[model samples]
Target: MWEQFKKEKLRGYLEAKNQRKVDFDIVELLDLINSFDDFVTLSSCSGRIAVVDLEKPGDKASSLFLGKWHEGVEVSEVAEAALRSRKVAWLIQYPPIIHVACRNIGAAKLLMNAANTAGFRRSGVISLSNYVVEIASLERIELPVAEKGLMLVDDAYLSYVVRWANEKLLKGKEKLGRLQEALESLQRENAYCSD
Candidate 1:
C-alpha cells in the first residue's frame, strides 16, 4: 500500500512539477519501469547535449545553456550558439540516466544488474531504503568551443564535435533499448511464476 501510494504521488509530481518534462526518447523505458508494482520511476533522460557558458567546469549554478538538444543537433545551430557566448562556452554530452525506486533490495539489485548488463556501467542503488537505483551509462564529452563571443575551435573542429556528440547520443539510446528488453524478460518470469 505504501509503495503504491508513493508511486502515484511520484507520477503526479513527474507530470506537474518536473521541469524537464518526460524525455521524448525514453518514454517507453520510463513506462516499463513504472508499470511494475515493485518499482516507481523518479527521473530520467535518454541523454543530453548542450552548448553553455560557465564560470567553472563543475559550477552548474553558474552555467547556462546557450543551446541544448535532447536529440542529435546540427553543426550550424551549435556554431550559432557558440559564437554568441558571453563567456566560456562548452559543448557537453551525457549518457542516458534513469532513477527508479524499487520496493526491496532484491528488486533494486535485479534492476541494477539489468542496467549494467545492458552497458550502463554506473547503475546502482545510491541511497535510502526505498532502494533508488540509478541507471546510468558512461559515454561523455566536454569540449570547450568558445569564449567571450569568439569561437575557440576552427570550423572543421566544430563540425567534428557535432558529429561525435551525436554518435555518443545514439549509443546511449541503444543501451536503453537493451535494458528495457531485459526488464521485460524479468516481468515475463514473474508472470510465469504467478501462474
Candidate 2:
C-alpha cells in the first residue's frame, strides 16, 4: 500500500514539475519528506505577501492581483500597486503551509504532532483512510489596504503594514526551519526503528 501511494505521489510531483506548477519554495523540503517511505508532500508554500484587487469578498472571477512578492518587499512598491486598484485591494501575508500524505494513521499523527511542536500549530488532518492520511496547514492573514478604487490608508500606514509583514515572514521562515529539523529527527528515529 505504501509503495503504491509513493508511486502515485512521484507521478504527481513529476506532472506538476513538468507543468511548471511546483511550489519552488518548498520543493526541496518536499523531496526531503518523500525520502521517507512513510510520508510524501503533496503541496506546500513557504509564505508570501501580496496586493490583490477584488470586486467583492470571495469573488475570484472579479479579482486582479496588483502585486505578489514572495520575499521581503518595499512599502513603496506595494503602495504603488495599491494605488492602481479599481476595486477592493488587500495587502496580505500568508504563513507557510504544507500538505502531506502519510502512509497510515500513526504516521499522520506523528507528523501532525511534530508540525505543531515546530510552530505549525494549525496543522490538522484533512482526510483519512486505511492506508493514507492527508494533513494541511492553516496559517494565513488578510488586510484591506484600499477600497472603491482608492487608497484606504496613507503611505505611512502602508509602510507600517509592510514592516509588520516582513517581520511575520521572518518568523514564518524560522518555523519552516524548525519543522524541517523536526522531520529530519523523525526520519532518523524511523530509520532506527526499521533497523
Candidate 3:
C-alpha cells in the first residue's frame, strides 16, 4: 500500500485531489526536480500572505482564504479582504513549503542539503518510509485581525503588519533563488546517476 501511494500521487492522483496545477512560483523548481531520476514533487506551496476565516486557528477543514497573495499586498486590500470574514479572521504570511518524494534516503539527503544551504532552516523528512522531504523557510506570521466582524487591529498597525509580511515574502523569494542554483549545481555534478 505504501509503495503504491508514492507513484499513485504522481499519476494524476494529486491533480484531482488539489483541483489545480502546481503553484506558479515554483513551476521552475518542479521542472528541475522532475528532470532527475530519483525525485518527484507532490503538493507544494510557494508562499502566501492572506486573510482567512476559521472556526478555530488549527481547524483546517473550516479554514477559508478570503484573500490570498503570493507576491505581496497593500494594506487597503488586506482590509477589504478581512471585512469579508464572518468568523475569526487572521492575517498570515505562510512560509514557502515543498513536499518532494525521493527514491532513496541518499536522494532525500541531497535535497535536504541543498534546501538547508539555501536557508530553509526548517527542512526535514516528514514521513515514515516515503523519504518525503519537506522544505520550509522560517518566514511565517499569523495574527487574528478580526473577530465577529469587528476590527481587532487599527489601520496604522495593520499597515505595519502588511509591510512586515511583504518583507518576509521577498526574503523567502531570495532564498528560493539560491535553492535553485544549489540544485542546479548538484545536477551538474551528476551525483545521482543520470538516466
Candidate 4:
C-alpha cells in the first residue's frame, strides 16, 4: 500500500523532471542515502515519520527522532523539513509509529538518542504494532536532487541489517555484541562524537 503511494508520488516527480530533460534511477539514490558517514535508523507509521541519527549519541538522537513529531502532513513535507534541517531523513513519509525489536540494544539506544536530539519530548519507546510487516515490505524510492545526488530508502541502503538479523537468529549466537559493546564503551570512555 505504502509502496504504491511512493511509486505514484515519485513517478510524478520524475515525469515533471523528465519534461526538463532530467533523468534519474533508483540505484543512484540508494547509494546517496547510504553515503552518510554517520549511521542512521528510521521507521514510521500512519501520518508520522521518525528518524534517528545514530551518529548523534546520548540523548540527542532520541530527542530528535521521538521529540520531533510532524504529524498529519504528507511524507514529502517531513522529508523536506529534514533535508532543510541538514539531518538525514532516515524514514520518509511513513506510518506515525515506531517500534523497537532488534537484538541490538545499543542500536536501540542510539535510535532513542537520535530521536531526542530532534526535539521530540517523549518518554518510553514508541512503536508501531504492524512494523514487522510494514518495514519488511518497503521498496526503494529514490528521489533525485540535481547535482547533489538521489535520496533512496535508508533501510534499503543498508546491506547488513538483514544479514545481521538472520545470522543471529539462525546461528543461535550473538557475534556482533562485542563490537557494539566495545564501540559504545569506547565512545563513553573517549567522549567520541559521531559527527
Ranking by lDDT: 3, 1, 2, 4
Task: Please give, for residues 99-195, the per-residue lDDT of candidate 2 as tens digits.
Answer: 7888878888888887778777667777775333333344456778988668888878888989999888877778778877887876677665654
Per-residue lDDT tens digits of candidate 4, residues 1-195? 534533553465455456842212222222221222222223222222343332233344333442233333333433454454333334322222322232244545654454343333342343432121112222222222111122444534332332332332222112112223433453466456655
Q: Write the per-residue lDDT of candidate 1 for residues 17-101, one digit (tens) a residue.
A: 3564777767777878877888888778778889889877878988888998888899998888888888789999988888888
Q: Which ranges of candidate 1 are over 4 A from the true structure?
A: 17-20, 188-195
What's model 2's lDDT at 37? 79
Runs in model 4 with CA error above 4 Å?
Answer: 1-43, 46-95, 126-195
Which prediction has the highest lDDT against the true structure? 3
- What is the TM-score of candidate 4? 0.21
Candidate 2 lDDT (Cα, 0 to 1): 0.78
Model 1 local distance difference test score: 0.83
Question: Model 3, range 46-91, lDDT digits (tens) per residue?
Answer: 8889999988987889999999999988998898889988998999
How many steric overlaps does candidate 2 have?
Answer: 0
Choose 2 or 4, whichever is better by TM-score.
2
Error of 4 at 146 (Å): 46
lDDT of each: 0.83, 0.78, 0.83, 0.32
Tell me each candidate's TM-score: 0.87, 0.86, 0.84, 0.21
Q: Identify the runs in model 2 with alpha carbons over 4 angstroms from their true place.
A: 130-140, 188-195
RMSD of 4: 20.8
Q: Is candidate 1 or candidate 4 better by TM-score?
A: 1
